[PDB]
From a paper:
A large-scale preparation of T. gondii tachyzoite mitochondria and subsequent mild solubilisation with digitonin resulted in the isolation of intact ATP synthase complexes, which we identified as native hexamers. Masked refinement of the hexamer membrane region resulted in a 4.8-Å resolution map. Refining three copies of the dimer model into the hexamer map resulted in a good fit and showed that it forms a cyclic trimer of dimers. No additional subunits or substantial conformational changes of the dimer units were found in the hexameric assembly. The C2 symmetry axis through the dimer is tilted 22° with respect to the C3 axis in the hexamer, thereby bringing into proximity the lumenal regions, which extend 80 Å from the membrane. The hexamer model shows that each of the three dimer-dimer interfaces contributes ~1211 Å2 to hexamer contacts. Those contacts holding the hexamer together are found in two separate sites in the lumenal regions, which form a triangular subcomplex. In the first site, three copies of the subunit ATPTG9 are arranged around the C3-symmetry axis, directly beneath the central lipid bilayer. In the second site, located at the periphery of the lumenal region, ATPTG11 establishes a network of five interacting subunits. A helix hairpin of ATPTG11, containing a central cysteine pair, extends parallel to the membrane plane and mediates interactions between the dimers.
Numbering used by the authors:
A (entry chain I1), M (entry chain H1), N (entry chain Q1), O (entry chain P1), P (entry chain O1): 96 to 166
B (entry chain D7): 42 to 104
C (entry chain O7): 9 to 157
D (entry chain B7): 263 to 314
E (entry chain J7): 78 to 153
F (entry chain W7): 54 to 105
G (entry chain X7): 2 to 83
H (entry chain C7): 32 to 153
């Protein structure tokens, strides 16, 4: 009976790894800013590109959840 | 956080003074000054009450 | 030098109250419109209403036996559906007919509907307060059922 | 005429706590006293020097 | 000392972390009702099922069994 | 004796006495704060009470 | 000022000191209702009024529990049946 | 694009004109009539303004009300009068007798008048 | 007059002065609702703080009571001398652990009951 | 029967109901008497610590002031002292 | 002593004995 | 003195850990002019002239 | 009918990753601050941005769970 | 409903990632206090902010658990 | 009485998830003492605070395990 | 030979995390010793303090495992 809900919940589990990746990204960002502020503006660009992948995958995940909670 | 642009809601200047926001003096504040001023009347009150009670209790206890 | 001759302690009280009220007016004027009106009128008013109603009036938890006997609340807003256990505050003069009409929204109720409390059926020409006092003292959980039998 | 010295409370709290206090006092008897008396010694020294 | 503490700063009646504040807090909770005894309407909520109550009843009824009187007190 | 059995009352037995030897002590002791100070920043208390 | 250890007192104050006006108003309303009930009693009643009771529906045609009086259709030599 | 953003700014400041007109009207109608006098103004000045004025004092969480108590450390010869000295000599120690008496009295009252509870009888 | 040049510019419409009387862009009931919402949502901090406080208050009670019950179980169950000899050291460890928890609770309580003003 | 909802306005009685529960369960009984004694013990310990602080302060004042020959009083009030006839 | 000259500020705060008055004031709920 | 100043600063200042800065929609003069430096200049040239 | 509760719990079993990411965030903040205090305002400025994503993911990690508890 | 009892446990399993995160955070705090001690007043503050998040998340992981244990 | 035991065993996972984090905390204490032996205290306070946090999480999960095992 | 065995086995999944924590502890001890041997007696002390939690937690889990094997 709870097929769709269970599958959606099992799909939603990768958000943990996504958040871990984002945390590693921004940790490296703040570390590189502490180690060389003069290139801060550059580092953030690459960090955003990282988000441009990570969040994108996360979005795909949530879309699949929305697909599977309603079949 | 300071900036050169002013938003819409903050367009019409300060409407409030500083004391409307900032906390009073830490050691010379309104209540402590008030109670230091009211100390004599309270001293009068409680001294009179205590003396009345003590005199009554003594008038009972002596005989 | 405490006190002055020709002046009364009541006059001094009036002085102090005037000072306090003027200070309150000044502090209310020089305050944020976003917060002060709410914090000074709407939360006090709601708290007053709620506490007075609870501490003064007397309320009842209402249940219904069957879903077919539930009222129609589709049209009225903020409550699209009946839920059992609703707390309902009433006046001491309320009767069972008035309660039934209040439940069913002044609309045609089902047939042979009656009220019970702890298994004990109420007459319809009965004061709800006294019927509860008699039958279910300090357990006002009422139930609406169909008496076909 | 009681079970106080044969109690789970005894064996769990009284003997362990007491034995630990005894062992620690025996092992750090002089460190503690010196650390305590440091201030008094310094004060007496200062007072005597000021007097002199 | 207490009187002077009242006019010292951060030393008013029960405010602060001083011993005067603790004593005033104690007097305040005493003056409150929460530690008062319950009324007769509310005795069978805790008091009639209390070890203190039972022990005191047994002590002041030396050779007797107050279970029945406790039941009747609950009924009352 | 139906309604007269809850009227047989007995008093408590606790004694509130304890000697307070401060000559043994030379250090201060910590103390709890029991209530918030409303004599200062009274107007802002609902607005800053949730912070730390 | 404040602290996490004072969260109990902060919550209690915020939730209870606004209720004190309502509590005093309830007490005043109760005292006034008692006053009006006692004035009514002094004026006079057919059947008695219980002062400390929630509701007093009793009258010439109504019991002390809101029901109709039994055997109240006729008149009685000693007057009221109560 | 130029056209459109320019006209956007144009009616941005149109709305600003409307806001300013209603602001003036609100003020001169309501607030100039409801303005406080200034008699009951706040009887203090903010610590930043005092610091800029060179006026702020930070110290003395406590105070000494009476000059007799203020000048004690400056007199150096009579910090306390003779009468005061003999009165102070009465409090060299705390009174355990009075502590005991008051504590026993308060415990008796609290126990046998304020903390009575019912007990069963057989 | 000095300010007549500026006060000549301040002439309003009927609709202007009605709008000002009502306070359209200066009352902001949406801002009032947002303030009320934020203020009510800020009540979670009290729950967090009381949770932390009760944990720090009961930490020594737990260390003294439940691990005590476990040790009491082991004492009730053990019979021989070797196991008892080895368990004495566990008991001493529990003593040290209790004192450690008491120090920690002291620390957190002086942190949670320290007020600036 | 136990699904007795109640209006969401009555959440303001959360703390009141909590304190009433803890009163009926703990405070108005023997455990409440123990709690009152606990509060009195807190007061006792605060007083003891205050007096201990004063004891330590005076115990240091003795050693550091009573044998100086330079502190007839506090230095902040030396303006009020008489003047030395030997200085010139 | 008259009501007026009793409740005069100088006499009230200097020469009068307000102990009984303020005790009655504190115990007002008891009497009520 | 330093404790006094640090306490008052921590309490009143606009920071990442704000105690008193909260529910701010109408700002006072000091904070307004500290955040909006354009208006301090305009409001100041007008006052002197 | 506990399968809905099971689905809600499974969907709620990903906040650990968000928490690990936030811990790494604030760890890098503290590290780069001890390495260079004068630049704190930037490390914080980026830190909040990271939270501005992570907390949002966590919010989803709650919201969908609640939905799976009822729908 | 035994699975309710399971669900609560699952809702608590995220604590395994939570505590880890907290640990990492305080680890960095200690490293900072071992590198630039004279700015403890900063680092502890930031750490508290982090806990102000992490605590809340953990509390959710408790609350929902208990809810799934009752409802 | 079979689902309760499994619920407790599944809830016991956060203990192992929490032991990691305490390990990292005390490792950081060790490394800080190795890099600056002149500061032993002010590192043990933060270490004990983090231990207390992770111990609180452990106590939470163990308490809920004992609860669900008999309720 | 039923659910009790399954629960007592599932309880043992935390021993991996406890072992990882112990490994982190003693790896930090080893690193600190190799860096500054002159504080060995300190580091070892702290390591033992860490074990005083970690080991104990493991023992807890083992006991609860037996409690789920003979509940």
């Amino acid at each position: 009976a709870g097929v769709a809900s269970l599958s959606a919940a099992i799909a939603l589990m990768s958000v943990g790894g996504v958040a871990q990746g984002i945390g590693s990204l921004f940790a490296a960002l703040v570390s590189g800013t502490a180690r060389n502020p003069s290139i801060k503006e550059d580092l953030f660009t690459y960090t955003l590109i990282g988000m441009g992948f990570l969040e994108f995958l996360g979005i795909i995940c949530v879309l699949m959840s929305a697909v599977l909670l309603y079949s | 956080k300071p900036s050169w642009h002013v938003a819409r809601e903050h367009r019409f200047g300060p409407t409030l003074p500083d004391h409307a926001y900032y906390g009073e003096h830490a050691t010379y504040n309104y209540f402590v000054l008030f109670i230091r001023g009211m100390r004599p009347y309270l001293e009068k009150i409680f001294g009179d009450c205590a003396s009345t009670i003590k005199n009554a209790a003594v008038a009972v206890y002596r005989p | 030098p405490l006190g002055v001759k020709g002046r009364s302690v009541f006059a001094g009280m009036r002085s102090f109250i005037g000072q306090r009220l003027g200070r309150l007016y000044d502090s209310f004027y020089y305050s944020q419109s976003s917060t002060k009106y709410v914090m000074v009128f709407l939360f006090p008013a709601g708290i007053f209403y709620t506490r007075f109603r609870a501490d003064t009036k007397l309320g009842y938890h209402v249940f219904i036996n069957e879903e077919k006997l539930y009222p129609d609340y589709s049209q009225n807003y903020f409550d699209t559906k009946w839920t059992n256990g609703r707390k309902v505050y009433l006046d001491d003069e309320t009767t069972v007919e008035q309660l039934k009409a209040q439940i069913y929204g002044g609309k045609a109720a089902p047939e042979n509907v009656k009220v019970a409390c702890r298994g004990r059926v109420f007459e319809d020409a009965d004061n709800v307060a006294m019927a509860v006092r008699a039958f279910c003292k300090r357990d006002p959980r009422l139930l609406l059922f169909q008496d076909n039998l | 005429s009681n079970t106080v010295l044969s109690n789970a409370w005894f064996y769990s709290k009284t003997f362990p706590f007491g034995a630990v206090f005894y062992m620690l006092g025996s092992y750090f008897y002089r460190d503690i006293r010196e650390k305590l008396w440091k201030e008094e010694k310094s004060l007496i020294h200062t007072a005597q020097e000021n007097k002199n | 000392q207490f009187w002077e503490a009242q006019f010292a700063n951060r030393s008013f009646f029960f405010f602060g972390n001083a011993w005067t504040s603790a004593a005033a807090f104690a007097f305040f909770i005493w003056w409150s009702r929460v530690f008062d005894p319950p009324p007769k309407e509310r005795l069978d909520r805790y008091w009639l099922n209390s070890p203190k109550f039972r022990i005191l009843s047994a002590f002041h009824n030396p050779g007797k069994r107050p279970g029945l009187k406790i039941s009747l007190m609950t009924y009352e | 004796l139906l309604g007269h059995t809850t009227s047989v009352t007995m008093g408590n037995s606790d004694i509130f006495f304890l000697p307070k030897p401060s000559n043994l002590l030379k250090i201060a002791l910590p103390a709890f704060v029991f209530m918030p100070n409303l004599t200062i920043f009274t107007r802002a208390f609902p607005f800053y009470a949730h912070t730390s | 000022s404040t602290s996490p250890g004072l969260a109990f007192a902060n919550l209690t104050l915020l939730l209870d000191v606004p209720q004190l006006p309502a509590i005093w108003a309830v007490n005043a309303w109760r005292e006034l209702n008692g006053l009006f009930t006692e004035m009514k009693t002094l004026a006079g009643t057919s059947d008695l009024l219980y002062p400390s009771n929630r509701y007093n529906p009793q009258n010439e045609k109504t019991n002390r529990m809101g029901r109709p009086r039994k055997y109240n259709h006729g008149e009685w030599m000693f007057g009221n049946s109560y | 694009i130029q056209h459109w953003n320019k006209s956007y700014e144009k009616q941005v400041y149109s709305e600003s004109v409307a806001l300013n007109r209603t602001f003036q009207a609100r003020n001169q109608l309501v607030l100039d009539r409801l303005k406080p006098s200034g008699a009951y103004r706040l009887p203090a000045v903010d610590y930043k303004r005092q610091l800029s004025r060179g006026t702020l004092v930070e110290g003395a969480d406590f105070y000494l009300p009476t000059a007799q108590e203020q000048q004690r450390l400056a007199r150096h010869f009579e910090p306390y009068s003779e009468q005061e000295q003999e009165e102070r000599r009465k409090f060299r120690f705390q009174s355990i007798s009075v502590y005991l008496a008051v504590a026993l009295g308060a415990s008796f009252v609290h126990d046998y008048f304020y903390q009575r509870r019912p007990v069963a009888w057989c | 007059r000095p300010g007549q040049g500026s006060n000549a510019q301040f002439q309003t419409s009927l609709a202007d002065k009605t709008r000002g009387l009502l306070g359209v862009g200066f009352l902001r009931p949406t801002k009032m609702a947002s303030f009320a919402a934020t203020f009510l949502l800020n009540f979670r901090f009290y729950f967090m703080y009381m949770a932390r406080t009760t944990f720090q208050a009961v930490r020594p009670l737990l260390a003294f009571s439940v691990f005590g019950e476990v040790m009491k179980l082991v004492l009730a169950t053990m019979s021989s001398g070797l196991f008892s000899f080895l368990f004495s050291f566990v008991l001493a460890f529990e003593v040290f652990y209790f004192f450690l928890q008491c120090y920690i609770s002291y620390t957190f309580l002086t942190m949670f009951f320290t007020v600036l003003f | 029967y136990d699904n007795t909802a109640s209006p969401k306005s009555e959440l303001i009685f959360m703390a009141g109901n909590a304190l009433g529960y803890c009163t009926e369960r703990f405070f108005e009984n023997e455990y409440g008497q123990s709690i009152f004694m606990f509060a009195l013990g807190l007061a006792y310990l605060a007083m003891l610590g205050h007096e201990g602080k004063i004891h330590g302060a005076v115990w240091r004042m003795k050693h550091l002031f009573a044998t100086n020959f330079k502190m007839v009083g506090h230095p902040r009030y030396a303006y009020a002292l008489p003047k030395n006839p030997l200085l010139q | 002593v008259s009501f007026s000259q009793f409740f005069d500020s100088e006499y009230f705060w200097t020469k009068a004995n307000v102990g009984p008055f303020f005790l009655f004031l504190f115990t007002s709920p008891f009497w009520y | 003195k330093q404790a006094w100043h640090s306490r008052m600063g921590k309490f009143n200042d606009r920071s990442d850990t704000p105690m008193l800065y909260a529910y701010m929609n109408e700002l006072p003069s000091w904070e307004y002019y500290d955040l909006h430096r354009s208006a301090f200049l305009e409001h100041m040239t007008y006052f002197l002239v």
